[PDB]
Symmetry: C2
Subunit: 113 residues, 2 copies
Amino acid sequence: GHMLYINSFLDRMGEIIRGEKSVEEADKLLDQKNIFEMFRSDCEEILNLYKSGKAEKEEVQRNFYLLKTYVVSQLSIHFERLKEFAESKGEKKLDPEVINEIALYIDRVEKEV
Amino acid sequence: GHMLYINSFLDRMGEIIRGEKSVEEADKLLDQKNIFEMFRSDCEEILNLYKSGKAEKEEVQRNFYLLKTYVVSQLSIHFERLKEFAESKGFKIEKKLDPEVINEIALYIDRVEKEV
């Protein structure tokens, strides 16, 4: 697989950084509970694509591999970047242990595939 | 939204790391000339999804944003990752990636991003 990559957190960060959406939005985004939920929804959406045959299994597997690798390798850095982007214009953080839980959840959901 | 994200370098790297492809393949992947041509071919595939109506302009705009930001901010890291991976595994690579080449790939994407 080679095309499919849902990631709501990443796209929403990009909207704010490109100045397409208000920096005020960083506040709900930088909330670890909402972040955990965003990824859950991503997982549910990707899985629904597989279940309905709309995306082939290999594209959904690629998306899960990318999503897990994003959470493990980039999410902590991105959160801090966006936290710093926001503050440098006028709070909370993301516990490494929540990041693990997101990775765990993606591992779980995927087993279905 | 958005679902589309073509990136051939990222996927091939991931395939070598996962063991789906031989480590023998890292050497070809990490030739900076092949790297530049790979991103050029990706832009063209992406442009053709738009031009064949398989992806809307905002999907391909998302792909080019991620691809441009991948090149400027992740491509050197993944290059080094893969070297470090091929070395441990016993196939040390004697290739490097010019900062200037990174710049020219980003700039090239920046170029085709300006559309159709």
